[PDB]
Each structure stands twice: as C-alpha cells, then as structure tokens.
Design a protein around this ligand. Structure first.
Ligand code: MG
Lengths: 104, 73, 145, 127, 143, 73, 55, 57
RNA sequence: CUGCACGCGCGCUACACUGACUGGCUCAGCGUGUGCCUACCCUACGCCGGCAGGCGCGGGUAACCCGUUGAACCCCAUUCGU
C-alpha cells in the first residue's frame, strides 16, 4: 503493498490538461477510489522580450513573446501496479505527466 | 468555551490596489483592533479621523456588541 | 542652558593655522581644519569627552588643548587604523592622520614622485587632464579654453 | 660614509633583496598583494630568469643589456631593481630603467600606449 | 487591564526600554561603539552616545513580533536608502557586525535564545518584563 | 543676515523677557526675523519659556513648533 | 599548430565563448532559460519554440 | 543524472521540436513534406512525417 | 575603439528648510534561480571583522528554500538654520 502516490500534470495548452484532469478524475472514481481535488497552483508566465528588428534602424519597437504553462496536481492512495493503467489510458502528445514515488 | 452563542460571526473583506483587508467581526462587546493593535494606534498619524471614521460618524454605541478584528496583507 | 553668554567668547579660534569659526558648534567648526573631516571630528570629540552640543568659543584653552592633542597623533588613544589618512605611508611605513599644510606637503610629494620616475598617473598630473581613467572627449570642457 | 638620504617603508633596499616572496606582500599594497597571492605564471618566471641572466653578465658599473618583453602585467619586483627592461606599447619596445622608486607600479606605466594629443582646429565638424 | 505591548505607542516604548537598560547596566557594550558608522549607507556617526542601548531596545521589539530572525534578517529590517551622489540611489542591507554583537549582548542578559533550525527567539524571561514595562509606559502615558 | 547674535547679549535678552510672551502667535520663524538671531537658540530659549510656564504647547511637530501667549481672560 | 598554445585563451566565462545555437553568431544572444540563440535567430522559430504572443 | 527545472524542460523539447523540423525540411524538401507531430513517452517515442509523396522517404 | 583646442543628442544628480542629517517606525507586485555540451545559481543560518568580505554548515531544478520577499518615498522625535 500500500502506498501514497501523487500524480502531476502540466502543459503549455490549458484545454488539453482540462480533459486529462477530469479523465483521471473519473478513471479513479469508476474504480471508486478516494481523490483529493485538482489543486490550483498559479500559472507561470514567462515574458521574454526582443527588439523585433535585425538592425538598428526603426522607431524603437519591441515585441513581447510569452508562454503560460499551467500545472495541476492530484493525490491518490492505491498500489502502484496500476501505474500502467494510470499511464496508458491517454496518449495525448501535448501533456507531460509525472507520478511521485510511492514509498509513502 | 463554545456554550453561549457560538458562530455568530461573518468575515468581510475590502480591497484597494493591492491591499486586502478582511475583518472577522464576532458578537461580543465593543472591541476593535487591527493586527493586534487598536485603531488610535496607527502609523500615518494624520489619518486618525479616516480609519476609526466609521466609529466616528455612525457611533460607538450602535456597534458595542461586535468584536471586529482585522488582518492586512 | 547657556542663558545669556559668558564674559569670554572667542569670536574666532586659531588652532594650527586655520582660524576656525567660533560661531559654529564643536563638531562642525573643526571640519574647517584642512585634513580633519566631518567623520574624523566625531571620533576625536567622543574620545575627548566634551559637550557635543556646545559651541566653539565656549570652552577654555585647556579644553581646546585636549582636543588638538588627541587629534595630533590619534594612534595612541585607542583609534583604529583603517580610519587614518596616511595609512602605511609609502615613504615612511607609518600610520598617521594629517591635519595641515603637511597634508598638502604629502599631497604634492605623491604627484611629483609619479612625475619623477614618470608613471602614467603623474603625466596626467603634469597635464591638465582627468587622472582616474575617465573619458575626456565630451566632459570638462572648461578645464581649458 | 658613501650615503644618500633615503627611506621607503622603514625598510631600506639593503634588506629588500634578501627578503622572501611571501613577506613582500606585508610591504606591498592591495592589488599587488592579490597578484602575489595568485600564481605568477610561467611567462613571469621566464622574464626574471632572463633578468637573472642579465644581472650576472653585467660589465662593471654598467647597465645590463636591455631585455625586450611583451607582458605588461608584472609587479615591479626587487629582484630586478636597477635593471634595463624593454616594454611593448602597441608598436615599439620602450626602453625603461628600473630604480628604487616605483616598486609599487606595473610595467605598462612606463611604456605609454597612446601618443598624447598635440593640436586641434575645427574642420567640417563643430558646426 | 490585561495589556500587551502591541497596544502601546511603540515609537516611545523603545525610549522606555533603552532607559531601562541604561539604569540596569548589565548589558555588554562592545569597545568599538563610537567608531562604527552603522550600516555604511549613512555618512555620520550617531548624535546619541548610548545608541547601543536603544539599538538593543529596537532589536528586542522586532524580534518579539517575528520569532526566528537571524543576524542577516536584522540587517534587512534597519536597512535604508544609500545616496550614491551623482548616481541614482539604491537599497542597502544593514550592518551585520553590530547586529551580531547586539544579539550576543542580549545573549548575556538572557533575554534571547536559539532555535531549532536557524534563528533566534526570546525566552520567557524576555517577554515577562517588557510586557510589564509596556503597560508601565502606557499607564504613565495616560498620566 | 550673516550669523548674528549667537549666544544672547543682555541688550536684547531683556527685549525678549519683556514682550516675547505678549505676542498672539509665537514661533521660531517669527522671532528669527524680529530679533537678529540665526535660529536654533530660539528653540532652546522657547522650550525653557515652556519649562517655566509662560507659553503653552500647541503644535509639537518635528519641523513646526508653535506656542502662544498666556490666556489673559 | 603546436597544441601547447593553439586554443589556449580560455573559452570560459565571457561572451567570446557563449555563442548562438543556430548558426554560430556570438552577438545579442539569449541565454535566458538556456536557449542560447542570438536575437535575429529566435524570431523565425518563435512559434516553433511555442512563445506565442499576447495573440 | 541530476535533473533540471520545468521551465528549462519545456524550452528543451520546444527547441528539440524546431531542430528536426529544420533538418527534415532540408532533407525531405522534394516530397510535399508538411511538418511533424511528435509524441514523447517513457517508451519508444513516435515521430511522424506528414509527407505527401510517401514513397521517396 | 576609452585618445581631447571644441560643437551637438538621450539621461543621472543637485541648486535645499515642502529640506539635509540622526534615531525610531513601517507597508508591495512582476519575476528569476545549480548547466546534455558549460565548468561559474538564489542563498537562509552560525561564528569571526568598523567594511567590502572570509569560514564552515543546510535548503532550493522551486505556491516547498531564499520569502509573511520586514523595498524606497513617506510617517514621527531630535540636531541643522537662509
Ligand atoms: Mg533658502
């Protein structure tokens, strides 16, 4: 065996990790486990800025690129034989999931 | 001890530009303070008439059963 | 509690060669000695155990005698050594705080030594130029005409 | 007898040469001490070795031969006080005599990099 | 009534506690007390003489609020505005070696004590007597 | 206008202790031009008139010290 | 030649050793987040990294 | 070995994705190439080339 | 490339008393942090030093540690007075 596991999920896009959120929500609760909800850690926005021009000529313009990464996080309790059907019920190229080690 | 009138208290917030300030007013007996210290004991010192002002223009008497205390961040 | 005035009030004092004003108070009249600054003054007076609120023409010339004597050589009255001016002096090896035209003696003797063995610092003193590695293309035009 | 008035830091030159490297920092000032705290690298040995070659083969009452070098990072050290060095400027090897004075300076101070300003009158510019 | 220190006019509460340590000369003043300059962003020595008693009084109050302030934290809380002159100003961290010797000064009087992780709290000796004199200056304020 | 009367003479100290408490408004910025003193000895002399009980304290501010006469009626 | 001293000036700290990731500039580079690209180079793949704009 | 931060992971595969898109454009120019789509797994990862003329690869 | 008989352009301080000092006292948000190559990161704490800093000992790849980010102006008490 019995463990204490934490599964993490984060991405660039939000709409994909909204579904991967609720799918593992129902995927534990179809096997009627106990879940604590999707904790809302704040969104990390990085705002690298460049001068938009290749040379020095212009009227001093600037562009502001940014990438907002969203991250959510869920505990469970179950043994870690079923880390495969936690892994392999969704493929989803744009999400990055991790599971914290299960020594409790 | 939770015998006589428990949980007759509401928590009410107000905000300006960053400053959240939420007061947890209980039922009690006329005791008002901010972060531990009272409202005549505040640091700008020229604005004494603008923070115990709701005690000023309304009155000490009407709000003498309430135990407002405030946290500021 | 100086109520009217005493019958003696030195209008101007006379300490080494600079007639310091008696009108100023103690810590800010002895800054006018060319060598004793505003921070070296307060160390001497708080060694001297004097009134730091009194004015300059309000003490006897035994009291002024003790103030000058302490700043005459500061090392022997418990004053530290990255506080003095001539720390580890390059002609003697000594530590001293200098107060007078001797400070201006040791000023120009530094400059001529850089001129005599002809270091690059001294040529900029032999010339009317900026010494400590600044630009000179655009600044300090009224150095010359 | 055979004397001139001199003093440097209470330490005359008659005990400077017979003095170790490690206590010359007790005399020298802060930036020269950090250089001697760190490694005098092999090209700094190579100059003083040729200087040790130059002092020994000196004709009597006479300068050594001048030594052309290209570094200008060296502390002026007492082991070559009284020697004839030649230090690069950008274009030439300027011919320099060491002496008791300047022990606390470098070897770029004695071979100027720029030639000083001379003149000036406004041409097209200075509107 | 039952009165703490928080409801006391603290800009002169410190004046009461520095008078307390001045009459009760059991605190250790270090020997370099007037060659100090106090956190190098400022350019004169203090106009007071027993400022170490009133610096000890201020570092007592700041530690009573936050239990667990180290010596670098004590530099953070007095630090101010360095005027560079021709360059724009900046923030300056305070003075370490006078904040450490004032915590060692409260170490001798046993108003202070060390903590589990890094930091320093104050002993029950330290908070019994200043809350006692906090009402004492508050009842003298009323009079 | 240049550093006059540091440390009182008797010729005007009587001129102080005759009529300087008579004034309606009494303030170092007022006596600094009526007499010929460069400040900072008013503030010593004004506080000792307060130490006697001639003038009464009103302002008590770190750059504005204001007193008044004795209340006649 | 003579590898005792060929590349001997130590390419370490300093912007003569940091370079552009794409095709070998050393000017105006972005070492932010360990991207190592010069300013001109970064704009073309801008989306290819994923840094979309405000919109 | 030791592991780096998330803010440098997302730029690391952001800059990984751009590079092979550059080379495969340089390599499969003649084919009707049109991009990539990458799937990172803790197994055999799966790059796919969306080439029109699939013979010439 | 920083060289200075001189001219011009963005900008920083000041010319004070609505301030300068000294000591109290106090309240922010955005954000970045140890590297495949690349080896140097933010640092709390403790003890040495008037100060830059030096020493061991620890966290942090981060809503975890720095960090309740005890920011400044300003508030107030003294000193300074055209
Ligand atoms: Mg004026």
């Amino acid at each position: 065996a019995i463990h204490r596991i934490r599964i993490t999920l984060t991405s660039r896009n939000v709409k994909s990790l909204e579904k991967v959120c609720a799918d593992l929500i129902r995927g534990a609760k179809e096997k009627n486990l106990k879940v604590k909800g999707p904790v809302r850690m704040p969104t990390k926005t990085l705002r690298i800025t460049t001068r938009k021009t290749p040379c020095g000529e212009g009227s001093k313009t600037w562009d502001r690129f940014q990438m907002r990464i969203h991250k959510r996080l869920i505990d469970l309790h179950s043994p870690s034989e079923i880390v495969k059907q936690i892994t392999s019920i969704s493929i989803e190229p744009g999400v990055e999931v991790e599971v914290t080690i299960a020594d409790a | 001890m939770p015998s006589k009138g428990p949980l007759q208290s509401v928590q009410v917030f107000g905000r300006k530009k960053t400053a959240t300030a939420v007061a947890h007013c209980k039922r009690g007996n006329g005791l008002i303070k901010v972060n531990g210290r009272p409202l005549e004991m505040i640091e700008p010192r020229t604005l004494q008439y603008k923070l115990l002002e709701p005690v000023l223009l309304l009155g000490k008497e009407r709000f003498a059963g309430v135990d407002i205390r405030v946290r500021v961040k | 509690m100086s109520l009217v005035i005493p019958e003696k009030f030195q209008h101007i004092l006379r300490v080494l060669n600079t007639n310091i004003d008696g009108r100023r108070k103690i810590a800010f009249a002895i800054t006018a000695i060319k060598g004793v600054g505003r921070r070296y003054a307060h160390v001497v007076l708080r060694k001297a155990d004097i009134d730091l609120t009194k004015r300059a023409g309000e003490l006897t010339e035994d009291e002024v005698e003790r103030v000058i004597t302490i700043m005459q050589n500061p090392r022997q009255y418990k004053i530290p050594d990255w506080f003095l001016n001539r720390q580890k002096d390059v002609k003697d090896g000594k530590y001293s705080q200098v107060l007078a035209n001797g400070l201006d003696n040791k000023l120009r003797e530094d400059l001529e030594r850089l001129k005599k063995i002809r270091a690059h610092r001294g040529l900029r003193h032999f010339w009317g130029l900026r010494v400590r590695g600044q630009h000179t293309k655009t600044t300090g035009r009224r150095g010359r005409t | 007898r055979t004397f001139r008035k001199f003093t440097y830091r209470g330490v005359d030159l008659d005990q400077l040469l017979d003095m170790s490297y490690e206590q010359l920092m007790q005399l020298y000032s802060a930036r020269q001490r950090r250089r001697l705290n760190r490694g005098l690298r092999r090209k700094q040995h190579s100059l003083l070795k040729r200087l040790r070659k130059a002092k020994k083969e000196a004709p009597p009452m006479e300068k050594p031969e001048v030594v052309k070098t290209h570094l200008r990072d060296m502390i002026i050290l007492p082991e070559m006080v009284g020697s004839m060095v030649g230090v690069y400027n950008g274009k030439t090897f300027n011919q320099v005599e060491i002496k008791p004075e300047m022990i606390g300076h470098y070897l770029g101070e004695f071979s100027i990099t720029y030639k000083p300003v001379k003149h000036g009158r406004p041409g097209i510019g200075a509107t | 009534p039952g009165v703490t220190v928080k409801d006391v006019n603290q800009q002169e509460f410190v004046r009461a506690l520095a008078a307390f340590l001045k009459k009760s000369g059991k605190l250790k003043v270090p020997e370099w007390v007037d060659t100090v300059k106090l956190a190098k962003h400022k350019e004169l020595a203090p106009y007071d003489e027993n400022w170490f008693y009133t610096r000890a009084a201020s570092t007592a109050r700041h530690l009573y609020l936050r239990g667990g302030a180290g010596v670098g934290s004590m530099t953070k809380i007095y630090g101010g505005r360095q005027r560079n002159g021709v360059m724009p100003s900046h923030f300056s961290r305070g003075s370490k070696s006078v904040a450490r010797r004032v915590l060692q000064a409260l170490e001798g009087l046993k108003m202070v004590e060390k903590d589990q992780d890094g930091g320093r709290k104050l002993t029950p000796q330290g908070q019994r007597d200043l809350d006692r004199i906090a009402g004492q200056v508050a009842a003298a304020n009323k009079k | 206008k240049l550093n006059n009367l540091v440390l009182f003479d008797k010729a005007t100290y009587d001129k102080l202790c005759k009529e300087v408490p008579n004034y309606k408004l009494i303030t170092p910025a007022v006596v600094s031009e009526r007499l010929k003193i460069r400040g900072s000895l008013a503030r010593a002399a004004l506080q000792e008139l307060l130490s006697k009980g001639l003038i009464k304290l009103v302002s008590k501010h770190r750059a504005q010290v204001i007193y008044t006469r004795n209340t006649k009626g | 030649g003579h590898q005792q001293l060929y590349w001997s000036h130590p390419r370490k700290f300093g912007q003569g050793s940091r370079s552009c990731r794409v095709c070998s500039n050393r000017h105006g580079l972005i070492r932010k987040y360990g991207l190592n690209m010069c300013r001109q180079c970064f704009r073309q793949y801008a989306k290819d990294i994923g840094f979309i704009k405000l919109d | 070995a030791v592991q780096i931060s998330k803010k440098r992971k997302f730029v690391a595969d952001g800059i990984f994705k751009a590079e092979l898109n550059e080379f495969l454009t340089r390599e499969l120019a003649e084919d009707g190439y049109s991009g990539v789509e990458v799937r990172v797994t803790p197994t055999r990862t799966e790059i796919i080339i969306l080439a029109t003329r699939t013979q010439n690869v």
